[PDB]
Design a protein around this ligand. Structure first.
Ligand SMILES: [Mn+2]
Length: 745
DNA sequence: TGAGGTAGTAGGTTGTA
DNA sequence: ATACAACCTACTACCTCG
């Protein structure tokens, strides 16, 4: 066996309680509230004074060294108050801020390859290291001949205990930017209209996209009224723009939509946002090179943070403070509790299934109401490839005969399907306007002889002729007719190949067509812990001013889906009204009632989303309905990656390994081997209840093993995950009865 | 959209100290 | 009576799957 760890570093030696210098601030300016301008006075006095540390207490300000009272600042008149040795047990936070400042100050000076400063730093938790680590432990730059720069963005976040030992929390991430800019684009003469950009010289909310390039000169009076060069002279940014040569002032104005008004800027002032789209559009070979760099297994992350922490060395302003290089031998010494969950025993038609894959030799758990008829929209120039593809998937689904060869790996009649090419209908479509796609789906609606669509779509790639997926999904959703779609690439794979890649494609295709007609393929044999039904919820927070409604789901102790639900009436902002909770749980109790003849006696409410709800609603509710219950909150994205240790060897964890502290616990739900990344585990936090977190983790990991639209695990469990997919697909709600036939899966 | 895993990139909002 | 750090959302790209 083996241990687990969190990526953290214990500091050798301790922090001594140092003499800190108090400073009050007062709002001379228009913002009388200093609490809304404490950061601005902080950063200005920290800036103007050799970047000596300038910290923030609840309403005051610290420096570790003596900086005089400076009152030139038009909003803040900083004055000295007292000089007291700050007790560490009073402020864990400010001594952690010291450890942060001293790692940033030790690491500013650290250069690489002689001239080159390694870590571009501005004294915060985020540390940009210019050089990288390869797999062979070489500090090398990674750039292209275009010029796209991979950079590690290290994240320190140190904390220090009551007496003075320090804990350094690290997490490494990749980062793209390019040394080029849009000025470097146009002086090279490339097209820029439509590009996502980032203004370093003015901080603007919303996401920026390039509208156009005016041929008008940047050195003339503007529609703002004065020249933009005077606009940045009044920005006091003259140390950058004074570097402008005659060709620099020869440049042209480039405007960019900023969701409120276009911004009249110069191309030098903008970098393009380097989404990985922009990489593959601008250097594919580089992207294929760095994909082994950005996805990181744990040995590589340990080498990366080992380089980082050796670049700390020893810091001496904290009295010869140094951090170790290794991780922990156990998280017990940090305060979490480890373990790995038993993998759930899973059952199918003939009882227990051994692999998740041989269900197609075992047959499905439950089949829906009888007989279903297929139907395919196809491109009129992609006919025979499509016909061989449908013949492959239907001979799989009915005959079990893999590209014309029967195998004992496939069982007959695994759906009770009805398809016959002399009987059925394939309406065709031309790859064209979306209104043709819509009227084609209507024409396949006008014959009431199809019971299930398998449409064919153009690809997720291919910016050419318009993608047919979403208008089909809208029009087939409003019919409440499920539709497992297939790309033309997938059609070519089924038509060309005879090999088992088409079998993998076909596995996921058939589990999709099952889970959309409401059949459920496999379920757990026995749920650990005594629970009747699960309840998902989530609310999406999409853009500025977006307040979504909670879409539930309800499973059983077998975990098979029973009902999901969309509320009646609108909520109070994003804070959901209590009667929507009432309405949902009314549908929950009647759903489990008329599906199993009894009220639920244990309800696990896996919630994503914030506690805009109130627990005492649930307390009064399930006290009057006198049934115990459990609200485990699942938070989907967490930065705390987890590593395994086998005698110093740092590997990615096997799935189902967890770490736990009280009422928060982390756990990986997916097996990723080497070469592919570090598993980004789950965040689970029991807001209420009377069950041990061990059993809630066991139920969550089993509900990641019952994803029913794949042969592999969903990272989220099917409660929160299917709640999330429904909340993305809020246009795909049921017309009438809100029952089953998962449109998302 | 196989399909969902990691991975980035922007971006908004609170929950807890 | 207000923080800031996690969450969470949106789109892609890579890459594997008896
Ligand atoms: Mn699907």
């Amino acid at each position: 066996v083996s241990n687990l760890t969190v990526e953290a570093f214990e500091g050798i030696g301790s922090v001594n309680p140092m003499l800190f210098y108090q400073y009050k601030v007062t709002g001379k300016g228009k913002y009388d509230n200093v609490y809304k301008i404490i950061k601005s006075a902080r950063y200005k006095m920290h800036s103007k004074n050799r970047f000596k540390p300038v910290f923030i207490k609840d309403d005051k300000l610290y420096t570790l060294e003596k900086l005089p009272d400076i009152e030139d600042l038009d909003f803040a008149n900083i004055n000295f108050v007292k000089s007291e040795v700050l007790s560490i047990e009073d402020n864990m936070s400010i001594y952690g801020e010291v450890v942060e400042y001293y790692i940033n100050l030790k690491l500013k000076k650290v250069k690489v390859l002689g001239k080159y400063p390694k870590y571009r730093i501005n004294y915060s938790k985020e540390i940009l290291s210019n050089t990288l680590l390869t797999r062979e432990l070489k500090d090398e730059f990674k750039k292209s001949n275009k010029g796209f720069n991979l950079k590690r963005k290290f994240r320190i976040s140190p904390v220090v205990n009551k007496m003075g030992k320090v804990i350094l929390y690290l997490s490494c991430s990749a980062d793209f930017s390019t040394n080029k800019n849009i000025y470097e684009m146009l002086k090279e003469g490339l097209e820029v209209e439509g590009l996502a950009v980032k203004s370093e010289w003015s901080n603007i909310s919303g996401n920026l996209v390039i509208e156009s390039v005016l041929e008008t000169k940047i050195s003339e009076p503007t529609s703002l009224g004065q020249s933009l060069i005077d606009y940045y002279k009044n920005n006091n940014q003259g140390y950058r723009v004074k570097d402008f040569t005659d060709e620099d002032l020869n440049a042209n104005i480039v405007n960019v939509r900023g969701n409120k008004k276009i911004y009249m800027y110069i191309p030098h002032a903008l970098k393009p946002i380097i989404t990985r789209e922009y990489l593959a559009k601008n250097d594919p070979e580089f992207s294929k090179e760095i994909e082994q760099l950005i996805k990181m297994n744990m040995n590589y992350r340990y080498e990366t943070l080992k380089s980082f922490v050796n670049d700390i060395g020893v810091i001496e302003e904290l009295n010869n403070l140094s951090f170790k290089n290794k991780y922990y031998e156990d998280v017990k010494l940090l305060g979490y509790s480890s373990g790995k969950i038993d993998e759930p025993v899973l059952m199918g038609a003939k009882g227990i299934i051994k692999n998740k894959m041989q269900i197609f030799s075992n047959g499905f758990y439950k089949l829906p109401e009888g007989k279903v008829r297929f139907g395919v929209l196809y491109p009129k120039e992609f006919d025979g490839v499509s016909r061989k593809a449908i013949r492959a998937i239907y001979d799989f689904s009915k005959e079990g005969k893999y590209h014309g060869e029967s195998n004992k790996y496939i069982a007959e009649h695994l759906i009770n399907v009805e398809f016959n090419p002399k009987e059925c209908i394939f309406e065709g479509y031309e790859l064209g306007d979306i209104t043709e796609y819509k009227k084609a789906a209507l024409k396949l609606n006008n014959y009431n002889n199809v019971d299930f669509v398998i449409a064919i779509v153009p690809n997720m790639s291919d910016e050419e002729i318009e993608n047919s997926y979403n208008p089909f999904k809208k029009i087939w959703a409003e019919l409440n007719l499920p539709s497992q779609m297939i790309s033309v690439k997938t059609a070519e794979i089924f038509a060309n190949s005879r090999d088992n890649t088409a079998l993998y494609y076909l596995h996921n295709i058939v589990l999709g067509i099952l889970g959309k007609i409401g059949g459920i393929p496999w379920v757990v044999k026995d749920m650990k812990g005594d629970v009747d039904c699960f309840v998902g919820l989530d609310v999406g927070t999409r853009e500025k001013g977006i307040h979504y409604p909670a879409c539930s789901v309800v499973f059983d102790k077998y975990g098979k889906l029973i009902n999901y639900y969309k509320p009646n009436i609108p909520q109070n902002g994003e804070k959901i009204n209590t009667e929507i909770l009432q309405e949902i749980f009314d549908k929950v109790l009647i759903s489990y009632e008329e599906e199993n003849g009894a009220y639920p006696k244990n309800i696990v409410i896996h919630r994503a989303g914030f506690s805009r709800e109130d627990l005492d609603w649930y307390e009064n509710y399930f006290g009057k309905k006198n049934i115990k219950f459990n609200i485990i909150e699942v938070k989907k994205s967490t930065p705390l990656k987890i590593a395994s240790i086998n005698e110093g060897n740092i590997t990615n964890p096997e799935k189902g390994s967890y770490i736990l502290r009280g009422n928060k616990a982390y756990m990986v739900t997916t097996d990723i081997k080497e070469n592919l990344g570090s598993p980004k585990p789950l965040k689970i936090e029991k807001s209420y209840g009377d069950i041990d977190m061990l059993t809630a983790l066991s139920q969550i990991y089993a509900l990641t093993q019952i994803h029913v639209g794949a042969t592999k695990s969903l990272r989220l469990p099917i409660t929160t995950g299917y709640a999330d997919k429904i909340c993305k697909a809020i246009e795909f709600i049921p017309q009438g009865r809100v029952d089953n036939r998962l449109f998302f899966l």
